[PDB]
Amino acid sequence: ATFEIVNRCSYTVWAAASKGDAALDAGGRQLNSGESWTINVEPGTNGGKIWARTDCYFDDSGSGICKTGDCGGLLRCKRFGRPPTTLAEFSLNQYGKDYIDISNIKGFNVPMDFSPTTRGCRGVRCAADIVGQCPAKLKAPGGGCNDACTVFQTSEYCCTTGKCGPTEYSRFFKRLCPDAFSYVLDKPTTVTCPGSSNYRVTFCPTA
């Protein structure tokens, strides 16, 4: 499956793609404002994620650091990134179908649209200004808006015991972005697409 990754932001981002124990495609690449990077993700990829990273420095070997979304200091990500990270999430060819969603469970750094390029389903979007409206105690001094699990490390925010409810913090993400996961047990906003769909992830989809 092809995922076109498009940076519409006015600033450079470093796209990342991983299923947590391995890179997807090259795993990561710089996208200046306007650039598009098309990756190929193996069919059957379960638990894949694509995100943006901001304010990165890499040396000639591709080791460095990013202020959001750093995945162990690598250009080419093999693992998930350091919150805060808006997440494009997907499982492909799961009993005949694809599943996609955007999640704010690991916080928010960059607005995102996640849409199929082929027929038979709809896209999802979290494009509100969450960083500028971020509650004071969630602001990440490094840039972005942390989720409350990252900030407070409690059973209620992290949903450790499997029994959490919505919170003042989750309700902020859900209010700004109704169509993205705000906490682990949020009512799902997952979209069912035909198996083997193709996709576009757009950073900063709106003005």
UniProtKB/Swiss-Prot annotation:
Localization terms from the record: Cytoplasmic vesicle
GO cellular component: cytoplasmic vesicle
Disulfide bonds: C9-C204, C56-C66, C71-C77, C121-C193, C126-C177, C134-C145, C149-C158, C159-C164
Amino-acid biosynthesis among keywords: no
Keyword Manganese recorded: no
CDD domains noted in UniProt: TLP-P
Keyword terms of this UniProt record: Cytoplasmic vesicle, Disulfide bond, Signal, Taste-modifying protein
Pfam families, per the entry: Thaumatin
Functional summary from the UniProt entry: Taste-modifying protein; intensely sweet-tasting. It is 100000 times sweeter than sucrose on a molar basis.
Family affiliation: Belongs to the thaumatin family.
Designated name of the protein: Thaumatin I
Organism field: Thaumatococcus daniellii (Katemfe)
Upper classification of the organism: Eukaryota, Viridiplantae, Streptophyta, Embryophyta, Tracheophyta
